[PDB]
Structures are given as structure tokens and as C-alpha cells.
Enzyme design. Structure first.
Site, PDB file in Angstrom:
ATOM      1  N   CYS B  84     -13.781   3.400  12.916  1.00 26.66           N
ATOM      2  CA  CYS B  84     -13.155   3.094  14.341  1.00 26.66           C
ATOM      3  C   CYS B  84     -13.821   2.777  15.529  1.00 26.66           C
ATOM      4  O   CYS B  84     -14.805   2.908  15.719  1.00 26.66           O
ATOM      5  CB  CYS B  84     -13.317   5.386  14.729  1.00 26.66           C
ATOM      6  SG  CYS B  84     -12.522   5.603  16.514  1.00 26.66           S
ATOM      7  N   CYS B  87     -14.729   5.434  18.627  1.00 29.12           N
ATOM      8  CA  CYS B  87     -16.300   5.896  17.808  1.00 29.12           C
ATOM      9  C   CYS B  87     -17.015   5.870  16.803  1.00 29.12           C
ATOM     10  O   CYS B  87     -18.375   6.996  16.509  1.00 29.12           O
ATOM     11  CB  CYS B  87     -15.185   8.240  17.964  1.00 29.12           C
ATOM     12  SG  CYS B  87     -14.715   7.783  15.885  1.00 29.12           S
ATOM     13  N   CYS B 117      -8.155   6.895  12.744  1.00 29.02           N
ATOM     14  CA  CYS B 117      -8.809   7.694  13.220  1.00 29.02           C
ATOM     15  C   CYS B 117      -8.343   9.236  13.611  1.00 29.02           C
ATOM     16  O   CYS B 117      -7.437   9.124  14.618  1.00 29.02           O
ATOM     17  CB  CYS B 117      -9.898   7.663  14.197  1.00 29.02           C
ATOM     18  SG  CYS B 117     -11.467   8.934  14.950  1.00 29.02           S
ATOM     19  N   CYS B 120      -9.700  10.600  17.408  1.00 30.09           N
ATOM     20  CA  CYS B 120      -8.772  10.080  18.228  1.00 30.09           C
ATOM     21  C   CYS B 120      -8.069   9.324  18.954  1.00 30.09           C
ATOM     22  O   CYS B 120      -7.252   9.009  19.917  1.00 30.09           O
ATOM     23  CB  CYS B 120     -10.278   7.941  18.628  1.00 30.09           C
ATOM     24  SG  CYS B 120     -11.939   8.607  18.721  1.00 30.09           S
ATOM     25  N   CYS B 143     -10.798  -7.636  -2.325  1.00 30.75           N
ATOM     26  CA  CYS B 143     -11.183  -8.754  -3.858  1.00 30.75           C
ATOM     27  C   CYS B 143     -10.663 -10.103  -2.902  1.00 30.75           C
ATOM     28  O   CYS B 143     -10.555 -11.575  -3.274  1.00 30.75           O
ATOM     29  CB  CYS B 143     -10.954  -7.822  -4.882  1.00 30.75           C
ATOM     30  SG  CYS B 143      -8.852  -8.372  -5.381  1.00 30.75           S
ATOM     31  N   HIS B 170      -6.328  -7.736  -9.288  1.00 30.88           N
ATOM     32  CA  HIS B 170      -7.929  -8.378  -8.639  1.00 30.88           C
ATOM     33  C   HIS B 170      -7.194 -10.017  -8.488  1.00 30.88           C
ATOM     34  O   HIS B 170      -6.319 -10.781  -9.985  1.00 30.88           O
ATOM     35  CB  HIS B 170      -8.566  -7.274  -9.671  1.00 30.88           C
ATOM     36  CG  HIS B 170     -10.032  -7.931  -9.339  1.00 30.88           C
ATOM     37  ND1 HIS B 170     -10.262  -7.435  -8.159  1.00 30.88           N
ATOM     38  CD2 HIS B 170     -11.545  -8.643  -9.840  1.00 30.88           C
ATOM     39  CE1 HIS B 170     -11.300  -7.392  -8.571  1.00 30.88           C
ATOM     40  NE2 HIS B 170     -12.197  -8.517  -9.437  1.00 30.88           N
ATOM     41  N   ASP B 187     -17.357 -13.526 -10.467  1.00 31.46           N
ATOM     42  CA  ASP B 187     -16.579 -12.499  -9.429  1.00 31.46           C
ATOM     43  C   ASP B 187     -18.050 -12.354  -8.646  1.00 31.46           C
ATOM     44  O   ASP B 187     -18.771 -11.468  -8.469  1.00 31.46           O
ATOM     45  CB  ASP B 187     -15.987 -11.480 -10.324  1.00 31.46           C
ATOM     46  CG  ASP B 187     -14.872 -10.357  -9.015  1.00 31.46           C
ATOM     47  OD1 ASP B 187     -15.694 -10.293  -7.857  1.00 31.46           O
ATOM     48  OD2 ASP B 187     -14.320 -10.198 -10.349  1.00 31.46           O
TER      49      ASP B 187
END
Ligand SMILES: [Cl-]
Ligand SMILES: [Zn+2]
Ligand SMILES: [Zn+2]
Lengths: 61, 290
Positions: B84, B87, B117, B120, B143, B170, B187
Site C-alpha cells: 500500500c 500505509c 488495502c 486504508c 513472468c 508462462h 527463465d
């Protein structure tokens, strides 16, 4: 109708056939490269050499 | 045609041109401590050859291994949910995606994620930037962002690189080893090199279509990543095998018209190596871990 029959309609083989038909000069290098990657395939190719070659030169779209 | 596999071939073929641009590559050298990756690669190279049993040489390959490592450790970050702004705490994913405001569209984000959040009552924005120039600054993501930026990076150092798209969501990179006269699985996102059965054997992934894309070629690289080709075939139910092949040939032949004779010949000599591997499925491998 041989040990290698199962390669006939595999996608990667169909592509191999199109390439080999359009680049005959690459046959020796193919046979050689198969000899490295896949000793057991090179051997089955040797047992039944004409079958394999007929597969490779059969046209595919 | 209308099949989505074919529609991604064309974006990806398009998209991958962006790496070759010495303007972007320049921008991507500004970011990279080569001097140190390349010098740590030589120190691992000098010692490796004391046990000369170690065949090959490997050199730009040792550098490749430093490239991945650096990327994982110093450069890029993994986004689960972003923290966040207000916060600094935990956020959760809202399934209704934020509409991309304007700057976000400019830097190629079509989907923006709502990282809420509860404390918040604050929507935090996780934009999903396609544009690798933005990722040099954002330096994070999953990815997609990791492969996409890591591929620009390979090219940036003069590497022959592909962007590799897996149908089952992927993506990664392939890198050519002049050394080994072959393409290498990379990768960055998972810190792995040259372990292509990671996805199927490591993850239990049920693969189908895996397509690689470079400045030179489009290649169906599926068969590199599998030892269960019959099962993979069963899942290739999206398009005719003829039509997929036809379409990649079309694309390679069109986009090779502006290459050299000898270059095109080098390519056909390499493709033999790949194609032999694709008919040489491995024997199904605990550690694709460690
Ligand atoms: Cl592997
Ligand atoms: Zn908060
Ligand atoms: Zn393990």
C-alpha cells in the site's frame, strides 16, 4: 510399417520433412546430428534406412 | 484466422522487434553492470578450466549465467500484490480490473490491477506494462514483465535472444550458445538455465503450444519442453497443425527476405539441431529445484 512409423505425422517431423525436401544438401548433417542427439534413433534409421528416407521425402502441406 | 494462437504469433513477432533498437538497447545498457557481470564470468571461466573434464568452453555462456543471476538479485522484483502506497502494508487483488488512466496506456498497460488495502480503503494500481522501456524504470512484475525485460537485456549485450510464449500462461527466454551450437532455455523469472523440463516435470504442467520469437525467426519450440509428446499432442486442439506450420513458415519466409544469403544458410543449419531435439524427447528428474 516399421519402428519409425510413429514419426510420420508428428508436427516436428513434418517440419523436418519440408526442410529436408527443400534442402537435400542438409541430409548428411541431419543424419550426423541425429547421431549425436539420438544414438538409438540413428541405429533404428540404419536397420531400416529406406523406410526413413521415404518418410523424409514424402510431401506434406 | 480467428484462432487466438495465430493472433498472438503476430503480436509477438511485431512486439519482439522493439529489442533490436540500439536506442532502447542503449537505454538498457545504462542499467547493466556488464564490466562486473562480464568480469565475474571470466573468474568463473578461468577456474572451471582447471577441471578440463569440463568440455565445451562456455564464455558468453558464463556471462549468460551471471546475467540471469544479476537480474534475479539486484535488478528486477517479483510482484505478488504491491504494498500500500499509504500505509505500506498487505494488499489483496480485486477481480474487477482498473481502467488504465492515460500514462499507463502510453507505456503499454491494457490491464491494470486493483490491489486493495482494506485498512486504508485504498485501491493501489498495478499496471501491466507491455512496453519494455517502462519496465527499465518500474523494474518489477511477474513472468511477463520479467521475460520481456530480460529479453531486451540479452539483446542489449549482443546476445541472440528469443521471447518464448507458453500457451498455459508462462513466458521466458531462449539464448543462443555459439559455444554449444544450440539454443538455451533461460527463465530469469525462475532463475533457471538449460532445464526445459522444469515446467512439465517440475510443475506438472500440461503443455500444448510453446512459440519462440526473435528478430530473425518464429519457431514452435514446444518439443524442447516436454518428454510426453503424445499427451502434448492431445492438448493441441486449438488450430490445425498444417495451419500453424503454414503460418510460421509464411512469417519466417516473409521476414527473411531482408536477410543475407549466408545468414539464411546459418539459420537452416541451426534449425536442423533443434528439429533433431524435438524428435529426441527425454526420459521422464527430482531437482528442477534447489
Ligand atoms: Cl530438463
Ligand atoms: Zn493501506
Ligand atoms: Zn527437490
Amino acid at each position: 510399417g516399421h519402428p519409425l512409423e510413429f514419426l510420420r505425422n508428428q508436427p516436428q517431423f513434418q517440419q523436418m520433412r519440408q526442410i529436408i525436401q527443400q534442402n537435400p544438401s542438409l541430409l548428411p548433417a541431419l543424419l550426423q546430428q541425429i547421431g549425436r542427439e539420438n544414438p538409438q534413433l540413428l541405429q533404428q534409421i540404419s536397420q531400416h534406412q529406406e523406410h526413413f528416407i521415404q518418410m523424409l521425402n514424402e510431401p506434406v502441406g | 484466422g480467428d484462432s487466438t494462437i495465430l493472433k498472438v504469433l503476430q503480436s509477438n513477432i511485431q512486439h519482439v522487434q522493439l529489442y533490436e533498437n540500439p536506442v532502447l538497447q542503449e537505454k538498457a545498457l545504462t542499467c547493466i553492470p556488464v564490466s562486473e557481470l562480464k568480469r565475474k564470468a571470466q573468474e568463473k571461466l578461468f577456474r572451471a578450466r582447471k577441471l578440463d573434464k569440463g568440455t565445451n568452453v562456455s564464455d558468453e555462456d558464463f556471462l549468460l549465467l551471471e546475467l540471469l543471476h544479476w537480474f534475479k538479485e539486484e535488478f528486477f522484483r517479483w510482484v505478488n500484490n504491491i504494498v500500500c502506497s499509504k500505509c505500506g502494508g498487505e494488499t489483496r487483488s480485486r477481480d474487477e480490473a482498473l481502467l488504465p488512466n492515460d500514462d499507463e496506456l502510453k507505456w503499454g498497460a491494457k490491464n491494470v490491477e486493483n490491489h486493495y488495502c482494506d485498512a486504508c480503503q485504498l485501491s493501489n494500481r498495478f499496471p501491466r506494462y507491455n512496453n519494455p522501456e517502462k519496465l527499465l524504470e518500474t523494474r518489477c512484475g511477474r513472468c511477463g514483465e520479467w521475460a520481456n525485460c530480460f529479453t531486451l537485456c540479452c539483446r542489449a549485450l549482443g546476445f541472440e535472444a528469443r521471447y518464448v510464449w507458453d500457451y498455459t500462461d508462462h513466458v521466458w527466454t531462449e539464448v543462443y550458445s555459439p559455444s554449444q551450437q544450440r539454443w538455451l532455455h533461460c527463465d530469469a523469472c525462475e532463475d533457471v538455465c538449460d532445464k526445459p523440463l522444469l515446467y512439465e516435470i517440475g510443475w506438472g504442467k500440461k503443455l500444448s503450444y510453446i512459440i519462440a520469437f526473435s528478430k530473425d525467426e518464429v519457431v514452435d519450440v514446444t518439443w524442447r519442453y516436454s518428454c510426453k509428446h503424445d499427451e502434448v499432442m492431445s492438448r493441441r486442439t486449438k488450430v490445425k497443425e498444417e495451419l500453424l506450420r503454414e503460418t510460421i513458415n509464411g512469417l519466417n519466409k516473409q521476414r527473411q527476405l531482408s536477410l543475407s544469403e549466408s545468414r539464411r544458410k546459418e539459420l537452416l543449419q541451426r534449425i536442423i539441431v533443434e528439429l533433431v531435439e524435438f524428435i529426441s524427447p527425454k526420459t521422464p528428474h527430482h531437482h528442477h529445484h534447489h
